Structures are given as structure tokens and as C-alpha cells.
Amino acid sequence: VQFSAEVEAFIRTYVKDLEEGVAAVFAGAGLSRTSGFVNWSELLREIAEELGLSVELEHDLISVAQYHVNKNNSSTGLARKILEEFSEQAEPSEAHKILARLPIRTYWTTNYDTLIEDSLKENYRVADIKRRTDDLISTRPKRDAVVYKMHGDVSSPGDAILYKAQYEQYYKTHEGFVTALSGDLISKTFLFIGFSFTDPNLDYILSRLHVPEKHRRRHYCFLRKEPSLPQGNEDEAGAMYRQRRQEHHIRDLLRFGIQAVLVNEYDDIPLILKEIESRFLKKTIFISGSAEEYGAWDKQEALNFVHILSSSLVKNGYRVVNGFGWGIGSAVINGALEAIYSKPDKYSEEQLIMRPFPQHSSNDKALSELWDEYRQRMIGLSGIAIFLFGNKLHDGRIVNADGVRREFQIAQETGVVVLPLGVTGYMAKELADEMLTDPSKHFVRYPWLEKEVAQLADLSANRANIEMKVLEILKKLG
Amino acid sequence: QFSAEVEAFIRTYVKDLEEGVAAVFAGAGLSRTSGFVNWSELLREIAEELGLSVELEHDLISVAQYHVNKNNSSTGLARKILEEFSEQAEPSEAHKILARLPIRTYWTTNYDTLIEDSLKENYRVADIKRRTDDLISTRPKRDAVVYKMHGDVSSPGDAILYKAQYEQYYKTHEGFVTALSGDLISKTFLFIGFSFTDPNLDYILSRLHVPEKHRRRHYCFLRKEPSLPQGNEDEAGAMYRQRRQEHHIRDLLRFGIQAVLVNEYDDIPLILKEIESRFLKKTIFISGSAEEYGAWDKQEALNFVHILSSSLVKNGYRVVNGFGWGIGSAVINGALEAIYSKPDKYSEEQLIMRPFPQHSSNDKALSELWDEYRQRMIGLSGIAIFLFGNKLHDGRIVNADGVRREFQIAQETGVVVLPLGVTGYMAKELADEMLTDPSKHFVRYPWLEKEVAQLADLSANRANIEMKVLEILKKLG
Ligand code: NA
Ligand code: NA
Ligand code: NA
Ligand code: NA
Numbered sequence: 032v033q034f035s036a037e038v039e040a041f042i043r044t045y046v047k048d049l050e051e052g053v054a055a056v057f058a059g060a061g062l063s064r065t066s067g068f069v070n071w072s073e074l075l076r077e078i079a080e081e082l083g084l085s086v087e088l089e090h091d092l093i094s095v096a097q098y099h100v101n102k103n104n105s106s107t108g109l110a111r112k113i114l115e116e117f118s119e120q121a122e123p124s125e126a127h128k129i130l131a132r133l134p135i136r137t138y139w140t141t142n143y144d145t146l147i148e149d150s151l152k153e154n155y156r157v158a159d160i161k162r163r164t165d166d167l168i169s170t171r172p173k174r175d176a177v178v179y180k181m182h183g184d185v186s187s188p189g190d191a192i193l194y195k196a197q198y199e200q201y202y203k204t205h206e207g208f209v210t211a212l213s214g215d216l217i218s219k220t221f222l223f224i225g226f227s228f229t230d231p232n233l234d235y236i237l238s239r240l241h242v243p244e245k246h247r248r249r250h251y252c253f254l255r256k257e258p259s260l261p262q263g264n265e266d267e268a269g270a271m272y273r274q275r276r277q278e279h280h281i282r283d284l285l286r287f288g289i290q291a292v293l294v295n296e297y298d299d300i301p302l303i304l305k306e307i308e309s310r311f312l313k314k315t316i317f318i319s320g321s322a323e324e325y326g327a328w329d330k331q332e333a334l335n336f337v338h339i340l341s342s343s344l345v346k347n348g349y350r351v352v353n354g355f356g357w358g359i360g361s362a363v364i365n366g367a368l369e370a371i372y373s374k375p376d377k378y379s380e381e382q383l384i385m386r387p388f389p390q391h392s393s394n395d396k397a398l399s400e401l402w403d404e405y406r407q408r409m410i411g412l413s414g415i416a417i418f419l420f421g422n423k424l425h426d427g428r429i430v431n432a433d434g435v436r437r438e439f440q441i442a443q444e445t446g447v448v449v450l451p452l453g454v455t456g457y458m459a460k461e462l463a464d465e466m467l468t469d470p471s472k473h474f475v476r477y478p479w480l481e482k483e484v485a486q487l488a489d490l491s492a493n494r495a496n497i498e499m500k501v502l503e504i505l506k507k508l509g
Numbered sequence: 510q511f512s513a514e515v516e517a518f519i520r521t522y523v524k525d526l527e528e529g530v531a532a533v534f535a536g537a538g539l540s541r542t543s544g545f546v547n548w549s550e551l552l553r554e555i556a557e558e559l560g561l562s563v564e565l566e567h568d569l570i571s572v573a574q575y576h577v578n579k580n581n582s583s584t585g586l587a588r589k590i591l592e593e594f595s596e597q598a599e600p601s602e603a604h605k606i607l608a609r610l611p612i613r614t615y616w617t618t619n620y621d622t623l624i625e626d627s628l629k630e631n632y633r634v635a636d637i638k639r640r641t642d643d644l645i646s647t648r649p650k651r652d653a654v655v656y657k658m659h660g661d662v663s664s665p666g667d668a669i670l671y672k673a674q675y676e677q678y679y680k681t682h683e684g685f686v687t688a689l690s691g692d693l694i695s696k697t698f699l700f701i702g703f704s705f706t707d708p709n710l711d712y713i714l715s716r717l718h719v720p721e722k723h724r725r726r727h728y729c730f731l732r733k734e735p736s737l738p739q740g741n742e743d744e745a746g747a748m749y750r751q752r753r754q755e756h757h758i759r760d761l762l763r764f765g766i767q768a769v770l771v772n773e774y775d776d777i778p779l780i781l782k783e784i785e786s787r788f789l790k791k792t793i794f795i796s797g798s799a800e801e802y803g804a805w806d807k808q809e810a811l812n813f814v815h816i817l818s819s820s821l822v823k824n825g826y827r828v829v830n831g832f833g834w835g836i837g838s839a840v841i842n843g844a845l846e847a848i849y850s851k852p853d854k855y856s857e858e859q860l861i862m863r864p865f866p867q868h869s870s871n872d873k874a875l876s877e878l879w880d881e882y883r884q885r886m887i888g889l890s891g892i893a894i895f896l897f898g899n900k901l902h903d904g905r906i907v908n909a910d911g912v913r914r915e916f917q918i919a920q921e922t923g924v925v926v927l928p929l930g931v932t933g934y935m936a937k938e939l940a941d942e943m944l945t946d947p948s949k950h951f952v953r954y955p956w957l958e959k960e961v962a963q964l965a966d967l968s969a970n971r972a973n974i975e976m977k978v979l980e981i982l983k984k985l986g
Binding site for chain 1 (some may be wrong): 632864
């Protein structure tokens with residue numbers, strides 16, 4: 032759970048930039064491999080062999096590809112290997128799924144595959160996909176993210192950027208992409224992921240990143256640190272040359288404002304991203320609860336409290352994930368929306384997260400499983416969960432709501448801080464009391480929280496001070 | 510009924526609104542209730558200070574530049590044509606309509622903030638571009654973008670005011686020009702508030718050139734020149750005034766702009782309200798609330814509401830959620846299910862949700878805030894459906910008076926009202942009330958009386974209600 036001082040500073044910075052909304056991703060081929068990297072020599076082996084060349088002797092693979100286009104006067108043979116087959120091997124990394132889950136608004140990529148767009152759709156995120164310059168003219172309304180496919184798309188291989196001659200003229204043929212990228216480079220913090228210094232195309236991509244020093248920003252790029260001891264037909268002299276050479280790569284990236292984030296293995300990347308996610312989600316609050324009745328609370332008193340709580344979370348900079356429970360979810364919605372439109376300059380519709388809950392069975396899944404998948408997904412978008420009331424009618428009598436407990440379990444199992452408010456009674460009280468029954472188990476990560484949950488579980492707790500105590504708890508948890 | 514040309518404009522803009530490609534380009538006239546500006550009078554004293562006269566100076570752009578040249582400063586000029594000028598800005602009826610409608614793109618050369626202010630009052634989140642720097646980043650989840658091409662009363666020092674700045678605009682404000690050229694080939698503009706006495710009209714129009722292959726047809730409101738003389742005119746001078754306008758009209762075409770001619774400026778809001786009335790026939794307000802469901806099982810009723818709302822989205826309608834207790838949550842879930850069912854064909858814009866009143870205010874009782882909420886939300890719709898409608902009151906179940914108030918607001922404003930009496934309670938009361946005086950409630954659509962009658966029977970068969978409602982809405986369209 033602890034990283035380098037350099038990685039640690041990157042985590043702190045990118046979390047903050049995710050919160051402000053200026054975080055961006057630039058994705059290379061490595062991101063579309065569970066491996067995390069690509070062997071370019073092997074990909075071009077056959078193209079070179081068809082020219083009487085060999086990737087062992089040819090170190091300029093961009094020129095080899097161009098020679099292939101020249102000799103056959105056509106892009107198709109090249110396109111089959113480096114675009115068509117290359118993209119069918121694409122697989123979503125763990126790092127890929129994390130980045131698609133986070134509320135990152137801007138994805139740039141030179142990949143041809145559809146993994147980014149596909150993952151966004153799976154996570155119920157409406158994507159504005161820019162596959163060609165024409166797509167840049169109009170903005171998809173209410174999009175959750177924009178995805179720039181700089182070099183085209185497997186969907187239209189004829190329009191993809193594949194070989195040297197196209198790279199050389201990209202600044203004119205695709206001026207719109209370059210202009211958009213230059214704007215994002217001076218307004219956003221990029222995470223470059225999936226790039227290697229054996230990428231034949233790297234220099235072309237990096238040369239597009241120049242901006243006036245007055246406006247230059249600092250960005251980040253994952254790189255695997257070269258291992259110490261030999262590889263293949265190498266000796267300790269060859270190993271040390273391989274390593275010290277990498278120091279010049281790292282310094283070169285600074286030209287473009289890019290700071291290398293070194294990892295010893297590609298498997299380290301998803302762990303760093305998970306840490307970023309967990310720290311970032313501490314400001315996204317899941318509201319769990321439902322009510323057929325309100326017990327020691329008057330209904331309008333309860334709904335008014337829920338409304339005010341939701342509004343305050345928005346006004347204090349939190350994102351609210353609505354559990355959509357009966358008799359609670361409507362007040363969550365109305366409270367958050369009231370705050371949003373109170374100050375449409377400051378707050379945003381992004382601060383209220385709503386996704387439809389299951390209504391009907393499917394042929395493949397019972398309502399049983401759709402509900403559990405819904406709760407897992409919604410809690411997955413949050414870092415803290417508040418539990419309120421929680422009761423429903425069953426065979427004519429009021430019972431504590433099992434679905435509220437299930438959300439509680441999912442949250443605990445996944446590291447989401449659980450904050451039941453026992454003063455609201457019912458399942459919230461049942462859960463608060465249960466936590467206090469084993470403080471060494473339930474309050475390991477935050478021992479100071481036992482006292483707070485105990486005060487808020489007291490049925491005679493002062494209801495006017497609940498909101499401010501919750502707010503102080505959430506700020507300390509962050 | 511309007512002229513054939515105006516009628517064709519109405520039909521085209523309604524469809525472009527529905528498609529989401531409608532745009533507005535607002536001139537000074539839109540910020541005056543009269544609909545026009547007297548430019549010679551605005552510059553009268555500027556000219557007098559240079560020893561000139563607006564009676565004899567026909568080029569007011571140059572007069573303003575001469576004022577800057579003489580004083581080596583735009584301070585005096587800016588006071589008259591920016592400060593005082595924008596202080597007299599008033600939202601016209603045409604302004605209010607265009608701010609109401611779901612137009613995504615507003616361009617303007619006005620300095621005032623009437624568009625931005627109206628959008629917020631209408632609970633529309635605006636992305637306001639006052640400077641080229643603002644163009645780099647897009648406000649997420651915006652309901653509209655507003656381009657202030659010539660700057661803003663907010664930062665007078667950065668506003669476009671005089672000839673020299675116009676001449677270099679294509680360089681200093683290149684971002685605005687590039688964005689406009691993209692919108693001109695992607696959207697259908699309505700130019701409103703411009704006259705051919707606008708000293709800077711040529712500067713504005715010259716920015717509208719695009720390759721013919723990509724040129725679209727736009728529209729521009731213009732007041733037809735009157736026949737009768739005015740101000741030192743006889744019938745020769747008045748006929749000269751009129752025939753000159755024919756060349757203005759023809760000239761607009763080389764920019765792809767078709768003049769929409771009106772006899773009076775007051776005709777503009779009438780054409781715009783006809784546009785709104787027709788456009789809104791695919792926006793459905795769902796009125797209803799329920800503490801209990803009577804002869805319906807609770808999950809049966811919520812399932813019906815869910816399916817109805819989903820079906821509305823899937824058949825191309827926008828759903829305005831009344832947000833009633835026990836009904837609004839199913840409206841939301843049904844619509845959201847449809848939207849994310851096929852997120853490439855359906856959109857989040859098909860569900861309209863705005864907060865309802867919770868707390869009294871020092872200037873408005875809760876009673877007033879509720880009425881204003883209902884008027885605003887019904888104002889967004891052309892058809893309103895009424896379902897159930899009951900609440901708890903002094904310990905008992907009563908029919909929901911709010912549902913009837915929403916019914917009355919709808920009827921008073923020309924919104925088609927479709928109560929489903931089979932859902933009982935207030936919806937049944939309103940269905941029976943309409944059926945008791947068909948002469949008054951079914952004037953516009955006589956065939957609707959039969960449909961309401963079959964849906965009003967408490968014993969009516971519930972399996973095909975949604976299918977019947979959708980057929981009714983399609984005919985109303
Ligand atoms: Na309270
Ligand atoms: Na509810
Ligand atoms: Na439950
Ligand atoms: Na009511």
C-alpha cells in the first residue's frame with residue numbers, strides 16, 4: 032500500500048486533477064494488452080521478410096513499413112498485419128478497466144482498437160467518439176467522455192494513419208486533431224500509458240506535444256524500469272548499457288513536460304491506478320436507504336433531512352450516488368438538483384449520479400442477480416456509503432430492508448467506508464449497532480470513527496447537528 | 510396561418526429543433542422590446558464631439574474610429590455604445606421564447622448578458638464563451654453554449670468596439686471564427702435582431718462564408734419596408750426605400766441566408782410561438798402522485814408508469830417528470846432504462862428533471878413556488894398525461910389538488926390534457942369533468958373525447974393502455 036516517493040507524488044497530483052476534472056489519458060498500444068507492452072520487432076517480422084529485410088538488422092521500423100507501401104504501391108498488406116490482426120489481439124488490461132471506470136472526461140489514443148469506447152459503453156458512460164476530422168465539428172450533448180482516435184479506427188481501415196508518408200503530412204490532413212490536442216495539453220493533466228521507446232511511431236506522437244513554455248503543463252508517462260541482470264544474449268556490460276541508456280529516454284520526455292513514472296513490472300500499473308481510484312472516490316458518496324415508514328421520525332421531517340443532506344454534500348464539493356431506494360431516493364435527487372441549479376456556475380449535473388435500477392427479469396438473469404449487479408456497480412462508483420432508515424413492507428408488516436444490508440456488505444467487502452446513521456432507525460440502526468459490537472473489526476482503518484458512529488447511533492441524538500457531524504466525518508475521511 | 514414562405518420556415522425550424530441542429534444568432538434588436546435599434550441616435554453625440562453629424566455621416570463605424578483616433582482612447586466611445594447601450598437591454602418576447610426552447614447553440618454580437626441570464630432563470634446550464642480562452646474547454650453536461658463574439662459587458666476592455674478591432678478580428682479572435690464556420694456547416698441558424706442600418710453588419714456577414722459544397726440555408730427576420738412615406742418622404746422616396754430592400758434581401762442569399770419578412774416586429778414572437786407550439790407536441794408532461802393505488806396493485810401501477818415512460822423515450826418523445834410522490838421515481842427509472850438500453854439512439858435529453866419546491870422563501874410562500882414550478886415545467890411540454898393523484902391530508906387519503914392545478918395550467922396554455930381515469934383519484938375526476946362538458950374540453954381534437962372516455966372507465970382493460978396512449982400521442986403530432 033506504499034510506493035516510491037515519485038509514484039506517491041504522482042498519485043497525489045493525479046487524484047487532485049481527477050477531482051478538479053482536468054485529468055486526461057493518452058493511451059498507447061500497451062494499454063490494449065494484459066502484457067502491458069508490445070513487441071514491435073515481431074509484429075513487423077513478416078513485412079520485413081517480404082522485402083528481403085529482417086527486423087534483427089532493420090532498426091527503423093517506420094521506414095520498413097513505408098518500403099512495403101512503396102513496393103506494393105498500397106496500404107492493404109501493411110494494414111492487415113499492423114491494424115487488422117494487431118487490433119483483434121486487443122484485450123482490456125486491468126489498468127484499462129480502471130481508467131474507463133473513473134470519471135475521466137478526455138481520452139486520447141493512437142490505438143485503432145475499440146477497447147476504450149467499448150469499456151465506456153459497458154460502464155454506462157455516453158462517449159463522444161472522434162474517429163475523423165469531421166466528427167470534431169459537433170459535440171455530442173450530455174456526453175460523459177470524449178475519445179479522440181488520432182490515427183483512425185478499425186471501423187474504416189482506409190482512413191487510418193499507418194505509414195510514414197501519412198505521419199509526415201498529419202499536421203495538415205488532421206489539423207483538427209492537432210489543434211484539439213494542443214488545447215488539451217495546456218488545460219489538462221495527461222497520463223501517457225502504454226507507450227514504449229521501441230514504439231516506431233513515438234517520435235511522431237511526441238513532436239505533436241510542443242506548446243509555448245509559458246503554457247506548458249506537467250504530464251506523466253508510465254515506463255517499465257530496465258531490469259538489472261542480463262536478457263537473452265547479453266552480458267553485464269550489455270545489461271548496464273541497456274539500463275543507463277534508459278536514463279536518456281527519461282530526460283528526453285521532459286522536453287514535452289512529461290515526467291516518467293517508473294514501475295518495476297507492468298503489473299504494478301493497475302495497483303498504482305487502484306490507489307488513485309480509492310483516494311479519489313473518497314469524495315463520492317453513496318446514499319443507501321429506503322422507507323415505507325419513518326418510525327420516530329415524521330415523514331416530512333425525514334424527507335427534509337435527506338433533501339438537506341444531499342444538497343449539502345453537493346455544496347461541499349461531493350458527488351452523490353443515488354441508491355434510488357423507495358421513499359429516500361426522491362429526496363436525494365431533489366436535494367442534489369436544488370443545489371446544482373442554485374449555482375449552475377459552480378456545481379454541476381455531474382455531482383448527481385443516477386443509473387436505472389432493475390425492474391424486470393431477463394431470460395438470462397433473475398431479478399435476484401440484476402439487483403446484486405446494480406448494487407455492485409453503483410457502490411463501485413463511491414468511496415463512502417451513508418445508510419439511512421431502511422425498511423419495507425413484507426407480508427403486511429414492516430421489516431428492516433435486506434437490500435440496505437446487502438449494500439452494506441458489498442461496501443465493506445470492497446473497502447468502501449460505511450457510515451450508518453443509527454438515529455434514523457431500522458436497518459441503519461441494526462447496522463450501526465452491529466459495527467459497534469466489534470469495533471476492532473469494523474473500525475480498523477479509522478479508529479476515531481467508532482465514537483462518531485456511536486454518537487450518531489443514539490436514538491436521542493440531536494437531529495439538527497447530524498448534517499454538520501457527517502460533513503466533518505467525510506472531510507476527515509478524505 | 511402565415512405566408513407560404515413563413516410557413517415553410519416554421520416547418521423547417523421545427524424539424525431542425527427536433528433534430529438538435531437549430532441555432533440562433535442574436536443581434537441588438539433581440540435585446541429591445543421594440544425589436545430594433547436607432548443607430549444614428551446612439552452615435553449622435555459621438556459625431557457632435559468630432560464636429561460631424563449623424564445626419565450627414567452614413568458610415569458610423571468610421572465615425573466611432575475617428576472618435577478613438579482623436580481621443581487616443583475608446584473610453585468615451587465605450588460609455589455610449591457599450592455601457593449605456595447595454596444598460597437599456599430588455600428581454601423581448603422573442604428573446605424569452607428562444608431562451609425557453611431547447612436550442613443548444615446561441616451566437617451573439619451583443620454585449621449584454623440577457624441570453625446568459627435567461628438560460629439560468631430557465632434552469633439551463635450555460636457554457637458562456639466570453640473570450641477565446643474559454644473555447645479551449647467544454648463545460649460538461651451543458652444545456653447550451655453561448656458565444657459572445659464581440660465580448661461582454663463583464664470585461665469592457667476586451668470588447669470589440671471600433672473599426673480597427675473589427676479589421677483584425679480574423680486574427681485576434683480566430684477561435685470564434687473557426688467555431689462559427691463549423692456551426693455554419695452543421696446547424697440551421699436563425700438570425701434575429703439585425704437590420705441593414707447596423708453599422709457593423711458587413712463585418713458580421715463577411716464571416717459567414719463557407720465552401721458552396723458545405724453551405725446550408727439559414728434564416729433572418731427582417732421587417733418589410735412600409736408603403737406609406739415617413740420623415741420627409743413622398744411616394745417617390747418611399748418607393749425608393751422599398752425597392753432598395755429587395756437588394757438587401759437578394760444580397761443575403763450569397764451567404765445562404767433567406768429573409769423571413771414580417772410586417773411588424775410584433776409578428777416575430779407570433780411566428781416563434783407557433784414554432785414552439787408545434788415543436789412541443791413531442792414533449793410529454795407526466796402529472797401524478799400516489800400515497801395509495803386503490804384498485805391497482807402498487808407494483809402493478811409502478812410497472813405501468815415505468816413501461817409508459819420507457820415507451821415514450823423509445824418512440825422519440827421527451828419526458829418531463831412532474832416528480833410526484835409515488836409516480837416520479839417510476840417515470841425516472843423507466844426513461845433511464847430506455848436511454849441506457851440503446852445509448853446510441855436514445856439520449857439523456859429525453860428526460861427532463863428539475864427540482865421541486867421544498868422550503869418557503871422570504872419573497873415567496875411555498876404556495877407560490879409550487880405554482881411557478883408547475884407553470885415552468887408544463888411550459889416545457891405540449892401534451893400532459895395525468896395518472897392517479899392522491900396524497901395524505903389530516904390523516905386520510907384525498908385526491909391531489911396539485912394534479913388538478915397542473916391540469917388547469919395545461920388547459921389555460923394550450924397544452925393537450927390526457928387524464929387516464931382508469932387510474933382513479935384525481936385523474937378520474939378530471940376525465941369525468943372533461944366528459945361532462947365535451948363542448949369546452951374537446952374543441953381542438955373532437956376525436957379525443959372517445960379516447961378519453963374508453964380510458965376513463967374504472968373497469969377499462971389495463972393490458973393495452975400504454976399502446977393506446979402512444980397511438981393517441983402520434984395522432985396529436
Ligand atoms: Na432534521
Ligand atoms: Na421515492
Ligand atoms: Na430491500
Ligand atoms: Na397536491
